[PDB]
């Protein structure tokens, strides 16, 4: 790697994601997740960037950001689940990244479904269905859709 492969890859990839319409290509998700998971030395910066990336951008990017938050979130969750407070010090990092998404996931989901059509809705329903199917998540931690109405009532 070189000095040209710094946070520039994450930003430039998310920017190229915003520059395009339709399609949620996994390559851009791979670059984002790659630079995040490469060393985990940045949490609130990466998280503020993807959340606000969804915030400032159209519908395709609400869905796209849900898939980005999904990959980095699940990867963070497994990586910090593999760790323990008896083998780590100084709170922060991916643990706090998930904790920070935990304050916006409610509006990210509820808007991403309300902005969606039957197809994108069903995709968001499938995303949360896979979260529940994986057993990596539990009840009272997914109410984010402002209760089942959104994609779960139909």
């Amino acid at each position: 790697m070189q000095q040209d492969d710094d946070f520039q890859n994450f930003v430039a990839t998310l920017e190229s994601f915003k520059d395009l319409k339709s399609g949620i290509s996994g390559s851009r998700i791979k670059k984002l997740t790659t630079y995040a998971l490469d060393h985990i030395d940045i949490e609130s910066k990466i998280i503020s960037l993807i959340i606000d990336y969804s915030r400032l951008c159209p519908d395709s990017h609400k869905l796209g950001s849900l898939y980005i938050i999904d990959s980095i979130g699940r990867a963070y969750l497994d990586e910090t689940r593999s760790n323990s407070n008896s083998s780590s010090n100084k709170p922060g990092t991916c643990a706090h990244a998930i904790n920070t998404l935990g304050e916006v996931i409610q509006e990210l989901l509820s808007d991403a479904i309300a902005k969606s059509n039957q197809d994108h809705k069903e995709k968001i329903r499938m995303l949360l269905d896979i979260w529940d199917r994986s057993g990596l998540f539990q009840k009272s931690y997914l109410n984010a859709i402002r209760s089942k109405c959104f994609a779960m009532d139909l």
Partner: peptide
């Protein structure tokens, strides 16, 4: 081909 490149789903982040 598909609308994604490479293909990706909530099944696995990696």
């Amino acid at each position: 081909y598909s609308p994604t490149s490479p293909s990706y789903s909530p099944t696995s982040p990696s």
